């Protein structure tokens, strides 16, 4: 850093811990016809 | 140094520690047109 005037400076050292986290493996994409819908749309569903 | 009467001297020796500092590389300078104000010097803004 840069110190050019007196004072009081507070700043955080980058060192610790960055965990990192997964990913959810559970979505599956069908592609079909339908009788009606919308059309060329990737819809969400999650229950009948 | 030179002697010549009798008496008390007091020297100091530049033999010691002479520190060098940092500058601030954080200023920049504009330049543009603006509708009215000072023309052609060099203002100085700190804040809007």
Do not use: M
């Given at each position: 850093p840069s110190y050019l005037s007196?004072?009081?400076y507070?700043?955080?050292?980058?060192?610790?811990?960055r965990?990192?986290?997964g990913?959810?493996?559970s979505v599956?994409?069908?592609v079909g016809?339908?009788?009606t819908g919308p059309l060329n749309?990737?819809?969400?569903?999650?229950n009948w």
């Open positions: 007196p004072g009081v507070v700043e955080e050292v980058a060192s610790g811990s965990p990192i986290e990913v959810g493996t599956a994409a069908f016809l339908a009788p749309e990737p819809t969400l569903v999650t």
